[PDB]
Write a protein that binds this ligand. Structure first.
Ligand SMILES: [Mg+2]
Ligand SMILES: [Mg+2]
Ligand SMILES: [Mg+2]
Ligand SMILES: [Mg+2]
Length: 456
């Protein structure tokens, strides 16, 4: 006889799996120590493959990787090598007819060495043929070789970095728009011929972190198509894989994530917003997806303004007229409006310091100042104005209160006789706060007054 067995004495396996690592994109070689078992230990051993072995994709016959076979430190082919008996080590083994250990090595890699294998399930047969002498006593060991390359698909930035897990959309309070996130992307895949199918897992929404019901719709496009929960197809030809490439890296494709108020012509409400763009990319027939989750956020800063009802700033100089006939000051009166983008919050109004009309050249005799707003008297301790009561809906533009009267009347200190004569000055500090929010408007009004004893 001639036989080829494992060095332990077991029969050669009829099957071999070549483990694939997607990290290195290579197959681990099968190695096994063997011995020739012979009738005749002086005869040469002629070793060949019956056919040139290939791994072939079970699904597609044109995709093939060559198998490489070595035995005894010699690479095998359909051309036979003759092993002289002397360096098979027949006396080393301690068993008659039995060689020393010879390594069998079965490897696979792509025909173009240094490139990555295409996705697929691969099979083929290695047919090891061994003879003696001039002979036709001939052993054939057939070893079914298997390998799997699982479909891989990734979406990367065009510098090869991962897409970010979070994105901020900058808000302009002037144009009342959010600036779109835009990034240049490339598909990386080991199955480049397949169509890429692109969906969102759910309809993305920019949602007020503190109110479920307050939403702005997010728009996502990739490669010049607006995406939805309904899948869109990108043919491999349309994705611009270079003919000179096989890393399966697409042409650069732009991803755009946009948001806008649900209704055109309107301002977003103050607050912090978020939702998740769940991008889903499928290889056509391979049943494999990558999901990319990108958290999208936006901040609409709370804003509060107090203006005259005509939209002018309040004055930074008020003068109160004196009648000596009635011995009393005429009040300053002005219609004002609160302009806000958080028109559910309570508005908190107070005075920052307590105002006086101080005498100009001696800083002693002082005529302190009454301030009223919205039909409510003001102190340095605050009055609460509920949002319903400011009547933001009741009037005209959204987020502008109906007209509230600001009344500033001085009538000095102790009551029911004439004030003392003199020229007077001072400063009203007014403070408005959008409640719970961390937002303050200060408005300083310089008050001046005259009593002159040279008139009636
Ligand atoms: Mg834009
Ligand atoms: Mg390349
Ligand atoms: Mg009056
Ligand atoms: Mg009296």
């Amino acid at each position: 006889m001639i036989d080829l067995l494992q060095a332990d004495g077991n029969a050669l396996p009829s099957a071999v799996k070549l483990a694939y690592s997607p990290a290195s994109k290579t197959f681990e070689s099968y190695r096994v120590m063997t011995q020739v078992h012979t009738n005749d230990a002086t005869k040469k051993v002629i070793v060949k493959l019956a056919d040139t072995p290939q791994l072939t994709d079970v699904l597609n016959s044109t995709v093939q990787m060559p198998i490489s076979v070595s035995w005894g430190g010699q690479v095998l082919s359909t051309t036979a090598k003759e092993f002289e008996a002397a360096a098979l080590g027949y006396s080393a083994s301690g068993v008659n007819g039995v060689s020393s250990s010879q390594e069998l090595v079965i490897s696979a890699a792509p025909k173009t060495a240094g490139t990555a294998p295409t996705a697929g399930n691969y099979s083929g047969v290695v047919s090891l043929v061994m003879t003696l002498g001039s002979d036709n006593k001939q052993v054939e060991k057939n070893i079914t070789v298997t390998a799997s390359v699982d479909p891989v698909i990734d979406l990367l930035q065009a510098d090869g970095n991962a897409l970010p897990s979070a994105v901020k959309l900058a808000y302009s309070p002037a144009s009342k728009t959010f600036e779109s996130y835009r990034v240049m992307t490339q598909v990386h895949t080991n199955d480049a011929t397949k169509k890429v199918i692109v969906k969102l897992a759910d309809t993305p929404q920019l949602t007020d972190v503190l109110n479920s019901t307050v939403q702005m719709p997010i728009s996502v496009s990739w490669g010049g198509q607006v995406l939805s929960t309904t899948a869109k197809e990108f043919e491999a030809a349309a994705l611009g894989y270079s003919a000179s490439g096989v890393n399966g890296v697409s042409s650069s494709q732009e991803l755009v994530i946009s948001a806008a108020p649900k209704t055109a012509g309107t301002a977003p409400t103050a607050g912090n917003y978020s939702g998740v763009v769940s991008l889903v990319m499928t290889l056509g027939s391979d049943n494999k997806q990558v999901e990319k989750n990108i958290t999208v956020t936006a901040s609409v800063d709370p804003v509060i303004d107090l203006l005259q009802a005509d939209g002018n700033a309040l004055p930074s100089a008020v003068k109160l007229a004196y009648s000596p006939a009635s011995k009393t000051f005429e009040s300053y009166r002005v219609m004002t409006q609160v302009h806000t983008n958080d028109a559910t919050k309570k508005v908190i109004v107070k005075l920052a310091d307590t105002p006086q009309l101080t005498d100009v050249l001696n800083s002693t005799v002082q005529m302190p100042i009454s301030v009223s707003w919205g039909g409510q008297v003001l102190s340095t301790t605050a009055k609460e104005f509920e949002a319903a009561a400011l009547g933001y809906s009741a009037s005209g533009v959204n987020g502008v209160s109906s007209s509230q009267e600001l009344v500033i009347s001085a009538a000095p200190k102790t009551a029911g006789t004439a004030p003392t004569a003199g020229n007077y000055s001072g400063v009203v500090s007014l403070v408005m706060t959008l409640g719970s929010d961390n937002k303050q408007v200060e408005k300083n009004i310089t008050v001046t007054a005259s009593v002159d004893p040279v008139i009636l």
